């Protein structure tokens, strides 16, 4: 027997194109570009012939293939994008087996309790020195694979370390005062507690809502206000904001304003209900999925690489042109880019040991009851890797992308495979360089960039992060924000109504009775650059206008003030895009005697107004708990346990355990292992064009080689 071609291929996820004139099918899936003619005994995979025992069969207008067609063709070996890893990289994430094993090891200890949940189960990293010797010298790492197991016993955090090689528990440590992040089952518990609440149903009814079963709740962290919010610092609490499900697929458009419930997760009950004035729920249907729109006609546009890709993925290692790097996934911060080297005429030079999102914060600026405490720490409090959004092929990434699946542990400790978790794609990016000398033949080369894209959705917002490898050594990091705006229900329908002015004091009126409350998106990236070695120094170069003292007609000249930034505290600063900040290697120079360096640009542009810092007065607590938000550049000494800008346990934290802590000792940054932290973000003032769904807005950052090379990096191999 055989199966229907279209059905099967689509299910498999391949794009299927039929050309009636040529009597040819073109099948595309990740790195495979296939051509097959009905009745032919051979097919073409990435330009190479593949024999087929069973030919594609055309019947009454239906194509049919053998039940082994998909594996014989796509897994043939002619698509060489993916290769088998021989010597397993020491930074490879925990496999599903290793995750299951870490879990049995802790469950075997006398303390595990039934309700014990897992906030994070991830590899405990081998020492960095041994990881680089493996990457560069191929030296085996002789330290045993270990896993960090962070548990939530009810509301108490315990840190456990297991030895996977020797299958034994190495430590089990209770962490006092820390609160755990919000876990998936907490969302279900909140909805259920609200649904069983007699008082909440009553509160809801007096605000116009008849069927309380149509109320959608959302769980938010409460932060810390030293008790002014009247909440016990000890309790595991979440605040709940509600909306009305009107059947348009967008409950976000029907807020129930001024009604907040405080839920105690251990007690499984509403412990408080804050209520303000009654504002009629905005009821108009506002779908964003197209159900009420016409679908325009558009002509096809495909980006094709008919002979395969220029990069190769061996296990989790990506090789592309002069770049080599390891890519893995973490449940909290998402993708981690490691052991990044640049092949310089045969020698692999170190560039970055570990790069990843550090953390982010989304603080609002309305003082009202349903808004004052809102300051989402998306990755730390919700787990962005866990909330990864599978890539919609051809839409969220170009038609020529390769989509990778990634495995992480779910909160119950069971392996979870995220399909299409990350997209890898090469892209044309204009001319790399060009010179059209008058009267001579032109000189132009195309620029190509390798993009590593990941998207994570947390509640109403969808974030997109791109790690861009330029063929010339430059590295870019862009963040895009899209999704549905968190909105405030208000009485004005227009700016002409009487309550308009007060309703829009903290946000723009983007629809009738709807205000897009002003807020900022602040992203922080932790980048452990090792500029051609571990020992580096921070150097400043500020372009300045100085009086001319050389004679001639000019009164001024353009010079530069160069100085080293010696310690962590002076390295924590605002970034003036008119200046230059370099991470240099004082032990190595280029051909002209200049220290090989990388220029750090925390601010390379953006499509929304830029956040110059956090928009909070200095006496606010969110301001105090999170310093990372106010400076764009920070440089700290390498410490394997300093990974988050907001701190390891930010939920209801009372003091900075993040960048403020990592730099408080003000250590020396002279000729030593440094870690760069770039903070960038936007200040979002809404507009009608962003409702019901917001157009993606992007922020850009860059890392450029500065005298790291001796000449134009992509000129090509020397002939003599």
Catalytic annotation, residues: 378, 461
Partner whose binding site includes residue 528, from Cu ion, a second copy, Ca ion, none (CB under 5 to 8 Å by kind): Ca ion
The correct pick among 636, 657, 680, 682 for binding Ca ion (CB under 5 A) is 636
Chain breaks in the chain following residues, C–N > 2.5 Å: none
156 binds Cu ion (CB under 5 A): no
Q: Which stretch binds Ca ion (CB under 5 A): 69-77, 513-521, 660-668, 707-715?
A: 660-668
Instruction: Give the interface segment with Ca ion, choosing from 441-449, 461-469, 499-507, 634-642 (CB under 5 A).
Output: 634-642
Could you tell me which residues are beta bridge partners of residue 16?
A: 27
Give 140 or 280: the residue with its C-beta nearer to a second copy: 280
The nearer residue to Cu ion, 35 or 684, going by C-beta atoms, is 684
Instruction: Give the integer Cα–Cα distance in Å for 465 and 463.
Output: 7
Q: Which residue is nearest to Ca ion (CB)?
A: 530
**In this chain, which stretch among 100-108, 177-185, 225-233, 663-671 interacts with Ca ion, using CB under 5 A?**
663-671
In three-state secondary structure terms, 263 is: strand
Strands (E), 395-499: 402-409, 415-435, 443-458, 461-470, 475-483, 487-489
Q: Is 616 in the site for a second copy (CB under 8 A)?
A: yes
State the burial class of residue 675 (Cβ atoms within 10 Å of its Cβ: 0-12, 13-18, 19+).
buried
Shortest CB 479 distance to Cu ion, Å:
12
Strand partners, 157: 152, 175
Cβ 549 vs Cβ 696: under 8 Å: no
Residues within window 589-608 making contact with a second copy, judged by CB under 8 A: 589-594, 601, 603-607
Pick the piece of the chain touching a second copy (CB under 8 A) from 131-139, 161-169, 669-677, 686-694.
686-694
Which residue from 207, 349, 684, 700 is in contact with Cu ion, where contact means CB under 5 A?
684
Report 502-541 residues binding Ca ion (CB under 5 A): 528, 530
Nearer to Ca ion, 220 or 531 (CB): 531
468: its two tokens: 């861009």
Binding of a second copy at residue 284 (CB under 8 A)?
no
- Could you tell me the smallest distance in angstroms from the CB atom of residue 378 to Cu ion? 12
| Nearest CB to Ca ion, comparing residues 356 and 482 | 356
The residue from 95, 312, 615, 661 that contacts a second copy (CB under 8 A) is 615
**Contact present, 337 and 353 (Cβ < 8 Å):** no
Closer by beta carbon to a second copy, 91 or else 450: 450
The answer to whether 59 touches 6, Cβ cutoff 8 Å, is: no
Based on the shown chain and the rule CB under 8 A, indicate whether residue 369 belongs to the binding site for a second copy.
yes
Binding residues for Mn(2+): 528, 530, 673
Q: Is 637 in the site for Ca ion (CB under 5 A)?
A: yes
Query: Any contact of residue 232 with a second copy (CB under 8 A)?
Result: no
Q: Cβ(408)–Cβ(387) under 8 Å? A: no
Distance from C-alpha of 358 to C-alpha of 380, rounded to nearest angstrom: 9
Catalogue the long-range contacts made by 610-614 (C-beta closer than 8 Å, 24 or more residues apart). Answer: 610/680, 610/681, 610/682, 610/683, 610/699, 611/520, 611/521, 611/522, 611/680, 611/681, 611/682, 611/683, 612/574, 612/683, 613/574, 614/361, 614/363, 614/520, 614/522
Contact assessment for residue 646 and residue 661, using Cβ atoms and an 8 Å cutoff: no
**Residue 577 touching a second copy (CB under 8 A):** yes
Choose one: 106-114, 352-360, 516-524, 663-671; the region binding a second copy (CB under 8 A). Answer: 516-524
Distances (CA, A) of 353 to 127, 527, 528, 535, 585: 11, 8, 6, 13, 15
Cα–Cα distance measured from residue 504 to residue 509, given in angstroms and rounded to the nearest whole number: 6
Does 691 engage in binding with a second copy (CB under 8 A)?
Answer: yes
Binding mask 669-688 for Ca ion (x = CB under 5 A): ----xx--------------
The neighbouring-strand residues paired with 683 are: 520
Smallest separation (angstroms) from a second copy to the CB of 357: 18
Please choose which of a second copy, Ca ion, Cu ion, none residue 636 contacts, taking the beta carbon within 5 to 8 angstroms, the exact cut-off set by kind.
Answer: Ca ion
Cβ atoms 257, 488 nearer than 8 A:
yes
Binding mask 62-81 for a second copy (x = CB under 8 A): --------------------
Under DSSP, is residue 515 helix (H, G, I), strand (E, B) or coil? strand
Q: How far is the CB of 354 from Ca ion (least distance, A)?
A: 9
Residues that bind Ca ion (CB under 5 A): 528, 530, 636-637, 662, 667, 673-674
Residues that bind Cu ion (CB under 5 A): 684
């Amino acid at each position: 027997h055989m199966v229907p071609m279209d059905k099967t291929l689509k299910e498999f996820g391949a794009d299927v194109q039929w050309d009636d004139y040529a009597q040819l099918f073109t099948l595309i899936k990740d790195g495979a570009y296939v051509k097959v003619k009905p009745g032919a005994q051979t097919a073409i995979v990435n330009g190479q012939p593949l024999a087929l025992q069973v030919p594609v069969v055309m019947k009454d207008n239906k194509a049919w293939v053998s039940d082994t067609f998909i594996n014989d063709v796509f897994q043939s070996g002619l698509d060489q994008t993916f290769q088998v890893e021989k010597r397993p990289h020491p930074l490879n994430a925990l496999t599903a087996d290793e995750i299951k094993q870490a879990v049995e090891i802790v469950k075997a200890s006398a303390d595990f309790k039934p309700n014990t949940r897992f906030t994070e189960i991830s590899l405990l990293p081998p020492d960095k020195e041994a990881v680089w010797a493996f990457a560069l010298e191929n030296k085996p790492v002789d330290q045993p694979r270990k896993a960090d197991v962070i548990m939530l016993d009810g509301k108490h955090i315990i840190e456990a370390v297991v030895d996977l090689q020797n299958n034994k528990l190495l430590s089990w440590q209770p962490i006092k005062d820390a609160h755990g992040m919000v876990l998936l089952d907490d969302f279900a518990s909140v909805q259920n507690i609200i649904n069983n609440s007699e008082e909440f149903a009553a509160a809801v009814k007096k605000r116009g809502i008849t069927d309380a079963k149509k109320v959608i709740t959302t769980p938010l962290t409460v932060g810390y206000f030293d008790g002014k919010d009247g909440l016990k610092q000890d309790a595991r609490l979440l605040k709940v904001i509600s909306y009305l499900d009107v059947g348009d697929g967008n409950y976000w458009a029907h807020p129930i304003e001024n009604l907040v419930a405080v839920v105690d997760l251990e007690q499984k009950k509403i412990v408080k209900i804050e209520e303000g004035p009654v504002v009629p729920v905005p009821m108009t249907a506002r779908p964003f999925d197209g159900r009420d729109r016409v679908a325009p006609a558009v002509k096809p546009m495909q980006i094709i690489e008919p002979e395969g890709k220029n990069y190769t993925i061996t296990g989790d290692m990506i090789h592309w042109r002069n770049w080599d790097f390891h890519l893995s996934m973490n449940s909290r911060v998402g993708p981690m880019i490691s052991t990044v080297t640049y092949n310089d005429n045969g020698t692999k030079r170190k560039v970055m040991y570990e790069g990843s999102l550090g953390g982010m914060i989304v603080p609002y600026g309305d003082p009202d009851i349903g808004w004052y405490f809102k300051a989402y720490l998306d990755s730390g409090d919700y787990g962005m890797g866990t909330l990864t959004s599978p890539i919609a092929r051809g839409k969220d990434a170009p038609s020529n992308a390769v989509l990778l699946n990634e495995t992480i542990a779910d909160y119950t400790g069971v392996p979870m495979e995220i399909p299409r978790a990350i997209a890898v794609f090469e892209r044309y990016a204009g001319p790399e360089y060009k010179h059209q000398e008058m009267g001579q033949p032109n000189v132009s080369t195309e620029r190509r960039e390798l993009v590593v894209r990941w998207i994570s959705t947390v509640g109403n917002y969808d974030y997109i992060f791109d790690w861009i490898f330029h063929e010339n050594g430059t590295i870019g990091i862009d963040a895009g924000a899209t999704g549905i705006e968190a909105v405030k229900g208000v009485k004005a329908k227009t700016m002409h109504d009487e309550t308009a002015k007060d309703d829009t004091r903290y946000g723009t009126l983007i629809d009738h009775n709807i205000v897009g409350t002003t807020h900022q998106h602040i992203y922080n990236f932790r980048l452990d650059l090792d500029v051609d070695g571990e020992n580096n120094s921070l150097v400043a170069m500020d372009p300045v206008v100085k009086p001319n003292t050389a004679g001639g007609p000019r009164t001024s000249t353009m010079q530069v003030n160069q100085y080293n930034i010696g310690n962590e505290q002076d390295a924590a600063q605002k970034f003036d895009p008119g200046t230059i900040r370099l991470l240099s290697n004082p032990n190595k120079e280029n051909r002209m005697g200049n220290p090989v360096s990388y220029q750090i640009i925390p601010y390379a542009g953006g499509t929304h107004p830029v956040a110059k810092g956090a928009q909070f007065a200095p006496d606010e607590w969110i301001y105090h708990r999170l310093s990372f938000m106010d400076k764009q550049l920070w440089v700290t000494r390498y410490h394997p346990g300093e990974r988050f800008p907001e701190g390891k346990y930010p939920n209801r934290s009372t003091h900075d355990t993040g960048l403020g802590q990592y730099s408080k000792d003000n250590e020396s940054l002279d000729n030593t292992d440094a870690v760069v932290w770039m903070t960038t973000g936007t200040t979002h003032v809404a507009r009608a064009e962003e409702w019901p769904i917001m157009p993606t807005e992007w922020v850009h950052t860059l890392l450029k080689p500065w005298n790291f090379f001796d000449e134009t990096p992509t000129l090509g191999a020397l002939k003599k």
